[PDB]
């Protein structure tokens, strides 16, 4: 399964997040490519360093629009993690990658304990932010991955940390590292 890929340097999109992305040359190429395709699918991947990243997030383009400063951003919603395979030039002038579905994770009882205690630290950290409205939603949230998502929007995590979350398909590994980073709130 082949999709146009857009590399981000300044956000990270995890499954479920909705983010604007300022479109550079490479990026509008990808956006154009995705809007032509059957599926409209867009792969969102962290910074290219010396290798294709192991994983990106399949995303749906919500809206493409001009923004302050004369440039354009695309609003995208992350849908699911995908493993990145082979690359090629493709339709349009986009970079195209073979992707495959990640396996979904069964609800281990220790995942539920990890998710429970990450939720406790998150609510404290949100309470420190006076993010009262978000505390409302986070209270109703039980989906570990969807909860693990929340930290993509966190301003106290580096984009390197967030990339490490993206590339960690293991939920119990994700929750644990999130517990550590969120537990840095002295």
Coil, helix or strand at residue 168: coil
In angstroms, rounded to a whole number, what is the distance separating the alpha carbons of residues 172 and 170? 6
Residues 159, 72 share a domain: no
Residues linked to residue 19 through DSSP beta bridges, in sequence order? 76
Residues 4, 95 share a domain: yes
In angstroms, rounded to a whole number, what is the distance separating the alpha carbons of residues 38 and 10? 28
Coil, helix or strand at residue 29: helix
The tokens describing 14, both together, are 């995890």
CA of residue 82 relative to chain centroid, distance? 11
Q: Annotate 144-168 with b (16+ C-beta within 10 A) or e (fewer).
A: bbebbbbbbbbeebeeebbbbbbbb
Check: CB of residue 165 under 8 Å from CB of residue 11.
no
The label of the residue with tokens 């699911």 reads 80
Domain end residue (candidates: 57, 78, 103): 103
Coil, helix or strand at residue 14: coil
Coil, helix or strand at residue 106: coil
Domain end residue (candidates: 56, 81, 103): 103
Residues 93, 8 share a domain: yes
Q: What are phi and psi of 89, to 5 degrees?
A: -70, 150
CA–CA distance from 12 to each of 113, 117, 132, 150 (Å)?
26, 24, 24, 12
Check: CB of residue 123 under 8 Å from CB of residue 134.
no
Domain of residue 137 covers: 104-186
CA–CA distance from 161 to each of 79, 157, 167 (Å)?
20, 6, 10
Give the count of domains, the chain: 2
**Resolution of the PDB structure in angstroms:** 2.4
Residues 116, 27 share a domain: no
Residues 48, 8 share a domain: yes
In angstroms, rounded to a whole number, what is the distance separating the alpha carbons of residues 147 and 124? 14
Residues 48, 115 share a domain: no
Closest alpha carbon to 121 in 107, 138, 109: 138
Residues 78, 18 share a domain: yes
Residues 94, 132 share a domain: no
Residues 42, 74 share a domain: yes
Coil, helix or strand at residue 71: coil
Residues 85, 18 share a domain: yes
Residues 44, 70 share a domain: yes
CA of residue 181 relative to chain centroid, distance? 17
Residues 127, 81 share a domain: no
In angstroms, rounded to a whole number, what is the distance separating the alpha carbons of residues 37 and 155? 34
Sign for the CA dihedral angle at 89, 92, 93, 96 comes to negative
The tokens describing 6, both together, are 């857009």
């Amino acid at each position: 399964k082949s999709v146009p890929v857009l590399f981000v340097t300044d956000t990270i999109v995890l499954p479920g997040m909705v983010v604007p992305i300022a479109l550079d040359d490479t990026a509008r190429a990808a956006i154009d490519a995705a809007q032509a395709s059957e599926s409209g699918q867009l792969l969102i991947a962290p910074r290219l360093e010396d290798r294709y990243p192991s994983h990106g997030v399949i995303a749906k383009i919500l809206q493409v629009g001009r923004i302050a400063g004369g440039g354009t951003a695309a609003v995208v919603r992350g849908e699911r993690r995908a493993q990145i395979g082979a690359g090629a030039s493709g339709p349009g002038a986009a970079l195209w990658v073979e992707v495959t579905e990640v396996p979904e994770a069964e609800a281990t009882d220790e995942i539920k304990a990890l998710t429970a205690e990450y939720k406790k630290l998150l609510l404290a950290m949100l309470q420190r932010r006076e993010a009262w409205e978000i505390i409302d939603y986070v209270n109703r949230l039980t989906d570990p991955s969807a909860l693990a998502d929340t930290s993509g929007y966190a301003s106290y995590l580096t984009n390197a940390q967030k990339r490490q979350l993206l590339e960690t398909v293991d939920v119990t590994e994700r929750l644990r590292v999130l517990i550590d980073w969120t537990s840095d709130h002295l």
